[PDB]
């Protein structure tokens with residue numbers, strides 16, 4: 001595991017403004033999106049080959065509140081001016097949400113929880129994974145940016161509570177997604193310093209890796225149909241081109257939202273849809289931007305009568321049908337955008353525990369469609385269809401019942417306002433817990449867990465080597481690739497995946 005240490009910006013020695021036309025030319029690899037998967041992918045490829053990583057956002061030093069645990073709230077409170085590390089959006093379901101716009105991607109703005117994929121996930125996918133290498137790649141990530149968290153009083157309360165509520169066994173400290181209660185890893189260190197995917201660029205070869213920031217990739221260029229390069233615009237609005245050469249490849253790592261958007265803008269997607277927008281079809285595929293998922297977050301907020309210490313989430317309660325955590329949160333008068341599903345939600349006057357359950361899968365899905373047929377800076381439309389699938393609603397009911405059981409534990413009893421027998425002894429911010437009343441509560445108070453995925457699925461858009469079917473020299477590696485979560489907290493899987501696929505590409509080519 002990593003030690004406590006300052007965020008390592010050594011890689012800035014090979015980070016350039018996209019305004020620099022001398023970045024234009026031929027590379028072995030172009031990676032689109034310097035995010036969770038993109039950074040370790042570009043770093044891994046750079047060991048042997050000339051790599052250009054293109055990121056639309058700027059560098060994290062521009063936004064210092066990205067670099068500490070106590071800055072997390074600030075980035076969600078900050079208004080979206082088009083340059084900030086948090087890009088705000090609202091799904092067509094009406095649920096507020098955010099995505100990253102910064103070098104390091106969503107690892108620079110997230111809640112830092114680190115876990116490995118459920119070990120059953122690999123065989124569920126039917127992909128022929130090299131499982132030894134998957135595990136070597138987790139250790140490569142974890143040695144760089146993951147710590148064993150110190151004890152935090154609220155996380156310890158919640159962990160005792162989960163165990164008392166029957167979320168067994170006690171797994172102690174473990175990175176594994178397994179049934180029961182555990183302390184997991186964190187990408188915040190014990191000093192509260194954020195570590196992130198951008199630090200994995202420090203593993204790249206500084207003679208082979210170049211990173212362009214404020215590089216907005218607008219189109220994949222095509223040739224036996226092959227990807228050959230990209231068009232990208234800089235912060236001044238000028239256009240630039242970069243190309244791959246020989247046996248090289250373009251990899252799209254622009255995320256659940258960015259990947260399908262760029263594929264559609266490039267003419268890769270459903271024929272009738274693209275034809276309807278007068279976008280010339282390069283490669284018809286009915287599934288680009290289809291099977292987009294957002295695992296529901298359902299929650300209560302308790303307001304203890306005595307202050308609790310704020311905490312980062314480290315203690316997880318895992319069952320097959322729900323994944324539960326709690327954060328202890330300082331009061332604020334500026335809302336954290338997407339913490340609550342709309343801007344019309346009460347402000348907390350005192351410290352509160354946000355007590356949460358996540359629906360696995362989920363089975364409900366929607367889509368990403370273009371808002372503009374030309375401008376990548378215009379966010380696409382996204383709809384998740386929360387609770388359209390009744391299995392999802394059934395699983396939320398089970399989770400909400402378990403949060404009921406948690407509020408009844410001796411662990412939580414000291415946080416009640418009134419020493420009465422029932423959970424009405426708590427004071428709530430927003431809607432308290434109440435099968436039909438649990439269904440209404442699930443449907444009406446749903447928020448994003450922020451762990452959205454899909455839009456470029458393996459088995460739909462991609463083959464088992466993450467290649468776009470029908471196109472040579474084009475891959476996709478990010479959270480657009482899988483229809484189900486790998487675990488409760490997927491950043492660990494997607495960081496591993498960038499390097500892993502990087503290694504498969506180098507092997508394929510060797």
Ligand SMILES: Cc1cc2nc3c(=O)[nH]c(=O)nc-3n(C[C@H](O)[C@H](O)[C@H](O)COP(=O)(O)OP(=O)(O)OC[C@H]3O[C@@H](n4cnc5c(N)ncnc54)[C@H](O)[C@@H]3O)c2cc1C
Pocket residue numbers: 032033034035036037038054055056057098099100101102103104105106107109110111112113114115215216217218253254255256258259262376449450451452477478479480488489490491492494
């Ligand atoms: C607020 C929040 C909290 C979270 N908390 C946790 C947690 O604690 N633990 C956890 O495991 N998971 C957490 N997640 C989820 C997890 O962090 C993400 O699912 C994962 O990081 C997604 O990785 P990605 O590579 O698919 O996307 P990203 O990391 O978002 O990378 C995509 C990159 O592409 C760039 N980009 C997009 N389009 C273009 C373009 N056209 N040209 C150039 N660049 C482009 C973006 O700016 C971005 O940097 C959280 C998510 C959020 C939003």
Ligand SMILES: *[C@@H]1O[C@H](CO)[C@@H](O)[C@H](O)[C@H]1NC(C)=O
Pocket residue numbers: 017018019058059213214235236
């Ligand atoms: C890139 O250069 C422009 C001036 O041409 C400036 O406005 C911008 O802030 C620079 N971006 C970065 C990331 O340095």
Ligand SMILES: *[C@@H]1O[C@H](CO)[C@@H](O)[C@H](O)[C@H]1NC(C)=O
Pocket residue numbers: 116119131132135176
């Ligand atoms: C990979 O690591 C996990 C623990 O995360 C372990 O259960 C599993 O046996 C390992 N698998 C292999 C193939 O080594």
Ligand SMILES: *[C@@H]1O[C@H](CO)[C@@H](O)[C@H](O)[C@H]1NC(C)=O
Pocket residue numbers: 151152153156
């Ligand atoms: C962490 O500290 C808390 C004190 O609140 C203690 O109860 C808990 O047992 C500790 N956990 C471990 C694994 O040491």
Ligand SMILES: *[C@@H]1O[C@H](CO)[C@@H](O)[C@H](O)[C@H]1NC(C)=O
Pocket residue numbers: 276277278
């Ligand atoms: C597509 O172009 C044709 C002209 O060839 C026009 O009739 C039609 O309205 C256009 N559709 C859109 C959505 O631009």
Ligand SMILES: *[C@@H]1O[C@H](CO)[C@@H](O)[C@H](O)[C@H]1NC(C)=O
Pocket residue numbers: 118119120121124177178179318319320321
């Ligand atoms: C792990 O994934 C497998 C297969 O997809 C599933 O059967 C199991 O419920 C998951 N375990 C947990 C604890 O989520």
Ligand SMILES: *[C@@H]1O[C@H](CO)[C@@H](O)[C@H](O)[C@H]1NC(C)=O
Pocket residue numbers: 370371372381
């Ligand atoms: C673009 O987005 C807005 C809301 O975000 C939506 O209401 C509008 O109709 C969208 N346009 C298209 C063409 O999808």
Ligand SMILES: *[C@@H]1O[C@H](CO)[C@@H](O)[C@H](O)[C@H]1NC(C)=O
Pocket residue numbers: 363364388389390391
């Ligand atoms: C829910 O999802 C499964 C696919 O995983 C499907 O069999 C079923 O039709 C869906 N249920 C509903 C209510 O649509």
Ligand SMILES: CC1(C)OCc2cc(C=O)ccc2O1
Pocket residue numbers: 072073111313325326327329330339354356
């Ligand atoms: C549990 C979850 C979703 O994640 C982490 C988190 C942090 C804050 C910080 O102020 C507030 C709420 C919150 O919620």
